[PDB]
């Protein structure tokens, strides 16, 4: 049997900018066992995103997640599983350990991952690494709270790529 339950029922999921890619192999693969659900190695990509960003985890889609964090190819075979985790990943003070890259020099290729923190230069003059005028850090943080509206609550997403 496969360690599927170790992917779905784990205590912690990774950031979207640095998503966790777990490979499943050499096992039976019993698939007999939500917010959304749509459909020889199997890869389970585990990460946390905002509710209204769930729609970007799909072929043909664009946006901050699809372009700068987790790019899913248009020629995609597999299932996307999402569920609300507002009871787990939210805190009254703001659960600010979930980060995503708001800006990037170029958009990502399929399954490309970049976890560098090089200062982003928006302007033409160098800032030498200092986040001053026209220079910004490339990984902001989601301030998840239990009282946010549905589209702003945290969702745990597992993408099963075949």
């Amino acid at each position, epitope marked *: *049997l496969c*360690p599927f*339950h*170790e*992917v779905f*029922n*784990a*205590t*912690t999921f990774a950031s979207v900018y640095a998503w966790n890619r*777990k490979r499943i192999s050499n096992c039976v693969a019993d698939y007999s066992v939500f917010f959304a659900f749509k459909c020889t190695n199997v890869y389970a990509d585990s990460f946390v995103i905002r509710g209204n960003e769930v729609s970007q985890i799909a072929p043909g889609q664009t946006g901050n997640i699809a372009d700068y964090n987790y790019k899913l190819p248009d020629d995609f075979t597999g299932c996307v599983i999402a569920w609300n985790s507002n*009871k*787990l990943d939210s*805190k*009254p003070s703001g659960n600010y350990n979930y980060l995503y890259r708001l800006f990037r020099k170029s958009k990502l290729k399929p399954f490309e991952r970049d976890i560098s923190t090089e200062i982003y230069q928006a302007g033409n003059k160098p800032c030498n690494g200092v986040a001053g005028s026209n220079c910004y850090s490339p990984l902001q943080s989601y301030g998840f709270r239990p009282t946010y509206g549905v589209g702003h609550q945290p969702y745990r997403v597992v993408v099963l790529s075949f």
Partner: antibody, heavy 124, light 103 residues
Framework: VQLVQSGAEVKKPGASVKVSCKASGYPFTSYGISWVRQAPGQGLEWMGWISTYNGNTNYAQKFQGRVTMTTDTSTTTGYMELRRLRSDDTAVYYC????????????????????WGQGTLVTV | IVLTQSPGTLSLSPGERATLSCRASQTVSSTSLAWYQQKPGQAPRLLIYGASSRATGIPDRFSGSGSGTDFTLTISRLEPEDFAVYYCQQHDTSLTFGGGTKV
């Protein structure tokens, strides 16, 4: 799911004790096995955890250097050995099937100890 | 890390509501907390996992909740069969149990 442990034993200080735990009713290599000790009049004290797939272990520091855990997949039975028994180690030793750590990836899971054995009484 | 439970001896009449508290010395994730119930002469059983999810087979009169360093267990009606010793558990770091309380 059930776990079957051994009967009571009497040991002398400095001796070692080996406690078995026969498991059935579930896929053996899909779940880990943990051990918890309960001395008379006391609460529960965690000894350690062992994977049934990788063989990886996680022992509580206080029991490090004294406790060794192993499993035998072909007989779906777990074993624990406690060495250099002290007079203060008299207790009932429980075997439990855990859902607190993955047996394959080794990362923490949401759960607890689901199936407990009878408890093996060791006197010393 | 240490877990502390109170009251140590919550002995209440049957049919009444009963509550137990568990406090942590440090913040723990709700994903790594559980409650146990031990009957006299018996091995303990899992009552609640994931802070608030009832273990399979457990009656709906048992309801857990909490966050941060303050977690509780509520029994809506205390039955004759509920007079047991309760423990709180965490595995946010290592794995530890509280001292336990008797009902």
């Amino acid at each position: 799911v059930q776990l079957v442990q051994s009967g009571a034993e009497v040991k002398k200080p400095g001796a070692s004790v080996k406690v078995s735990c026969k498991a059935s009713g579930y896929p053996f290599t899909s779940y880990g096995i943990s051990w918890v000790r309960q001395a008379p009049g006391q609460g529960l004290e965690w000894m350690g955890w062992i994977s049934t797939y990788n063989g990886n272990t996680n022992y509580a520091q206080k029991f490090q250097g004294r406790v060794t855990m192993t499993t035998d997949t072909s007989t779906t039975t777990g074993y624990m050995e406690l060495r250099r028994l002290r007079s203060d180690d008299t207790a009932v030793y429980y075997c439990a099937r855990d859902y607190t750590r993955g047996a394959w990836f080794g990362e923490s899971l949401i759960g607890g100890f689901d199936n407990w054995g009878q408890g093996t009484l060791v006197t010393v | 890390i240490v877990l502390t439970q109170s009251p140590g001896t919550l002995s209440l009449s049957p049919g009444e509501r009963a509550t137990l508290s568990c406090r942590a010395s440090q913040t723990v994730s709700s994903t790594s907390l559980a409650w146990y119930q031990q009957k006299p002469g018996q091995a303990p059983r899992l009552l609640i996992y994931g802070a608030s999810s009832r273990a399979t087979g457990i009656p709906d009169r048992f309801s857990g909740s909490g966050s941060g360093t303050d977690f509780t267990l509520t029994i809506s009606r205390l039955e004759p069969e509920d007079f047991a010793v309760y423990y709180c558990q965490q595995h946010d770091t290592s794995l530890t149990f509280g001292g336990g309380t008797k009902v």
